[PDB]
């Protein structure tokens, strides 16, 4: 059964010349992809947004979900703090930069609307111990310099 | 104070957690070492041990430094 297409490019929720998925109802522009695809370089066959790719890749199984996210966070064991944020963009959908409302609550001199417009009103451990001991040697020499500063003021 | 060791709640209700930050997580004395129970590895233990002893070393040394320099300005004050 063919669904209906949403006439708004949810990246900025504005209409124009756009194309939509075969299983997803919402549409997007040509240049709003990553990589941004040309108006004429249309993909061969059926193209989906991040969502339906996610769906047919996951096999609607939470087991596969946590499996590939686990071996993913194990892949990025060097940036492990950012791994959970990193895994989301490879399946999330792009949308224009809109800072949340929590920021602009400080100045009434700005006006916005639904337009989105603005108006004016291992060797790793060795290197870490390297840095540790060089800084501690620095600070112990500078602390005997501290007490010697006190002594030189005592030379008054 | 008292225990840092839980009981063994088996029946396959013992759930594990692998924290996304390695060099600061505290969480209990209730770890499990991998190559609620926290899953931790030898590298994080190495780093935490070295960090604790280094910073305790330098803190106690600066405390003795400040105490002794205060002593010298108090004694020359006489």
């Amino acid at each position: 059964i063919d669904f209906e297409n949403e006439d708004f490019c949810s990246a900025c929720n504005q209409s124009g010349s756009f194309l939509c998925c075969d299983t997803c109802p919402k549409s997007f522009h040509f240049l709003c992809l990553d990589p941004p695809i040309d108006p004429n370089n249309l993909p061969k066959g059926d193209w989906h947004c991040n969502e339906c790719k996610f769906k047919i890749f996951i096999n609607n199984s939470m087991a596969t979900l946590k499996k590939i996210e686990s071996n993913f966070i194990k892949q990025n064991n060097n940036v492990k703090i950012f791994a959970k944020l990193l895994f989301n963009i490879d399946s999330h959908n792009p949308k224009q930069f809109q800072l949340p409302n929590y920021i602009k609550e400080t100045f009434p001199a700005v006006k916005t609307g639904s337009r989105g417009q603005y108006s004016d009103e291992d060797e790793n451990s060795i290197k870490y111990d390297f840095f540790d001991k060089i800084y501690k040697s620095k600070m112990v020499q500078k602390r005997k310099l501290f007490q010697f500063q006190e002594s030189l003021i005592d030379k008054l | 104070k008292v225990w840092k060791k839980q009981r063994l709640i088996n029946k396959k209700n013992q759930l594990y957690y692998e924290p996304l930050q390695k060099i600061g997580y505290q969480n209990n004395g209730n770890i499990q070492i991998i190559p609620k129970i926290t899953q931790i590895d030898e590298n994080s233990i190495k780093y935490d041990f070295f960090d604790k002893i280094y910073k305790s070393k330098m803190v106690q040394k600066r405390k003795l430094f400040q105490f002794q320099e205060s002593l010298i300005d108090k004694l020359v004050s006489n």
């Binding site: 111990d129 | 840092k4 004395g29 770890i31 070492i33 030898e42 233990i45 041990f49 604790k52």
Partner: peptide
């Protein structure tokens, strides 16, 4: 530089894996 050698020396001298695990658990508790 030498602390890597310390941890490797401990891993060698303990000889076993369960004993080294208990050693790491002691170190974590501290």
């Amino acid at each position: 530089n030498e602390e890597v050698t310390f941890f490797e020396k401990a891993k060698r001298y303990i000889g076993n894996k369960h004993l080294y695990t208990e050693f790491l658990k002691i170190l974590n508790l501290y």
